[PDB]
Structures are given as C-alpha cells and as structure tokens.
DNA sequence: AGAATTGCGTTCCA
DNA sequence: TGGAACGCAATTCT
C-alpha cells in the first residue's frame, strides 16, 4: 500500500540532503508491531503519515564527532553533575529562564561552538522528516534562537558513565513537557549492544552510536537508556518545552527571574 | 568547614 | 493524592 511508498519518499529526501545512502531502511506504523532491534535507518508513522520517530545512523562526520567528544569529556571531568543544559528552561517555574550552565564552560562550548554546527544537521533532519516541526521552532522568540544558537530553545547534556543506574535517562520516563519531538545526537564511545534507547511500551531497542541522530516524541513514547559496562556515553538532546511558547521570559537566570516575576504582578 | 536538610515551585500519575 | 521529577540553590545539621 502507501507504506512501502512512504519509505521511498523519506529515503529520497534523507539521501539527497545528508549525501549518503541508507541501506536496510525499514518503516512501520505506531499501531503495528515495532522492530525488536534497530541498527539501520528506521521510521515510524501515524495514520496521517506524520513521522513519530526517525533514526539515521552516522550523519555526523567522524572528525566532528571525535572533536566534540574530546572536548565534552575534558569539560565534564571538571564538573560535578552528570547533566548540563544550555539555552532556556521552564522547570518548576511560571517562566522561562537562562540555564545556570550557560555561563559555565559547558554552556559556553555548547552555545558558541557545538550548537551552531549541530543546528545545520538539525536543519537537515527537520527538513526531511518533519517540516512542521521546524515551522514551529521558528515561531518562537528571537531571543531563544540567539541564546542557544539553535532552532531548539534548549539543549540537554547527558554524561553516562558505566554502572551509573542513578542517571535520569537510566530510568523509564516520558518528557511530559516537550511540545515537539526532540533531536538527539550522540558522542563518546560505547559498544553496539549497550547504551541503546529502548521504547518500553513498544519493546523496541534502538542501538545508538556516536554520530547518529534520533528524532522522536519523548512526551508520548515511554523510553529508557540501557547500561554500559565500558566506554563513555555522551548524548545531546535538543528539545522544546510547552512553556517556551506559553510562559514569559525575563532574560535572566531562575532565581533572579522569580524576583522579576513577582514585581511584574 | 563539610553534610544534610529544607526551600521555591511546576507537573505528572500509580 | 503525595511522592517524584530535564533547576538551583539557601538553611540547617554534625
Ligand atoms: O540519551 C538518550 O538516548 C535518551 N535521553 C533521554 O531520554 C533524555 O535525556 O531525556
Ligand atoms: Mn527522555
């Protein structure tokens, strides 16, 4: 039916934009049974034909992956928490606020160096699999795009070391604040069988590797990251919260913006 | 001084 | 319903 034709349509855009051939490409529907193991190109869709998930292996040049990896590991070494955020954030507040890390070495490296380059591949990704996602991100405040140097208002930095079951991505969850599907990039170095992203309700395991992109709705599909016994799993999650369009913005950090939010009452 | 706890606040779901 | 949770600390303990 229109199932086989939709894959050829998506592959046509992805191959010509990324300038690479995606062999063994598969496609399913959100109602049907998902693949137990995913190691190649993969798309899932709804009844309308919209893309709910897209996984494109090895889209980032190896030099770019190695360069960002060594810098990420160098910065994270001098950090305490295993998570980092650049751009804006609206968690536990009635407003959007500048992340604390943005002024730090991690947030400066992301916003000034990483994000401007990754934004190009995010642009490649969105123009192929989800046009109305990039159409939404460009309707946001100009300050968000300038602060994060990316279509996505905020970026998550996940540093997953071996035997760290305490990490937030190691626990099954849904990012229930996401308004748009997130774009996920991976770095570091880890095995094919570990550090995969599993969608629990669908019993689907996506074996991600440094250099790959993952695009899916973290707000609808429950997901979790598997443990690694060796290596170092570093992932970047480019997302957009519902509050990025609803909640106001005072161009400041969290606690400082709370004082401003009370004075503007 | 640590550490341990509490605080400000939003949103969810077993 | 009340703990838990992509923040981010100031207060209160040993
Ligand atoms: O890192 C991954 O593969 C998935 N990450 C998340 O679900 C997250 O950061 O919320
Ligand atoms: Mn998530």
Q: How far apart are CA A148 and CA A126, in angstroms?
A: 17
* Token duo for residue A59: 């889209």
Q: Which residues of A are annotated as a binding site for 2-oxoglutarate?
A: 158, 168, 186, 233
Distance from the alpha carbon of residue A245 to the mean position of ligand 1, in angstroms: 22
Strand C at less than 7 A from CB of A241? yes
Q: How far apart are CA A93 and CA A90, in angstroms?
A: 6
The CATH number linked to A66 is 3.60.130.30
Number of domains composing chain A: 1
Q: How was this structure determined?
A: X-ray
For residues A228 and A191, the answer to whether their CB atoms sit within 8 Å is yes
Matching residue, tokens 């995969």: A196
* Token duo for residue A32: 């049907």
Closest alpha carbon to A190 in A238, A237, A155, A226: A226
Q: For A233 and B3, how far is CA from C1' in angstroms?
A: 30
Q: Which residues of A are annotated as a binding site for Fe cation?
A: 173, 175, 223
Q: How far apart are CA A36 and CA A206, in angstroms?
A: 8
Nucleotides in chain B near protein beta carbons (<7 Å): 8-13
Structural domain that includes position A25: 1-265
A11 in the Ramachandran plot: left (φ > 0), alpha (ψ -120 to 50) or beta? Answer: alpha
Q: How far apart are CA A63 and CA A194, in angstroms?
A: 23
Q: How far apart are CA A54 and CA A214, in angstroms?
A: 6
Beta strand A154-160 with A232-239: parallel, antiparallel or unpaired? antiparallel
Q: For A91 and C3, how far is CA from C1' in angstroms?
A: 18
For residues A98 and A71, the answer to whether their CB atoms sit within 8 Å is no
Helices (H), chain A: 2-18, 62-77, 105-109, 115-129, 131-137, 142-148, 243-246, 254-263
Strand partners, A238: A155, A183
Matching residue, tokens 């991600």: A208
Q: How far apart are CA A249 and CA A138, in angstroms?
A: 17
Distance from the alpha carbon of residue A217 to the mean position of ligand 1, in angstroms: 11
A176 alpha carbon, closest ligand: 2
Which contacts qualify for A90-94: CB closer than 8 Å, 24 or more apart?
A: A90/A177, A90/A241, A90/A243, A90/A244, A90/A247, A91/A177, A93/A247, A93/A254, A93/A257, A93/A258, A93/A261, A94/A247, A94/A248, A94/A261
For residue A223 and ligand 1, the question of a CB distance below 6 A is answered with: yes
Q: DSSP letter string over A113-154?
A: IIHHHHHHHHHHHHHHH-HHHHHHHTTS-HHHHHHHTSSSSE
Matching residue, tokens 């503007």: A264
């Amino acid at each position: 039916i229109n199932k086989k034709s939709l894959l050829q349509n998506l592959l046509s855009k992805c191959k010509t934009t990324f300038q690479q051939s995606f062999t063994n490409a598969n496609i399913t529907l959100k109602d049907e049974k998902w693949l137990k193991n995913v190691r190649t190109a993969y798309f899932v869709c709804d009844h309308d034909g919209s893309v709910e998930l897209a996984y494109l292996p090895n889209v980032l040049p190896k030099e770019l992956v190695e360069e960002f990896t060594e810098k990420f590991e160098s910065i994270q070494t001098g950090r305490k928490k295993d998570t980092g955020y650049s751009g804006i954030l609206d968690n536990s507040m009635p407003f959007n606020y500048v992340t604390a890390d943005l002024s730090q070495e991690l947030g400066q490296y992301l916003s000034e160096i990483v994000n401007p380059q990754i934004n190009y591949y995010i642009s490649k990704l969105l123009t192929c699999v989800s046009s109305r996602t990039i159409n939404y991100l460009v309707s946001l405040n100009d300050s968000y795009y300038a602060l994060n140097n990316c279509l996505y208002p905020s970026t998550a930095f996940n540093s997953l070391k071996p035997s760290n079951d305490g990490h937030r991505i190691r626990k099954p969850h849904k990012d229930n604040l996401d308004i748009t599907p997130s774009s996920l990039f991976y770095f570091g170095n880890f095995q094919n069988t570990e550090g995969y992203l599993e969608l629990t309700d669908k019993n689907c395991k996506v074996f991600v590797q440094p250099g790959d992109v993952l695009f899916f709705k973290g707000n609808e599909y429950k997901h979790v990251v598997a443990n690694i016994t060796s290596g170092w799993r570093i992932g970047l999650v480019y997302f957009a919260h519902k509050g990025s369009k609803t909640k106001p913005y005072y161009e400041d950090t969290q606690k400082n913006s709370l004082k401003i939010h009370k004075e503007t009452k």
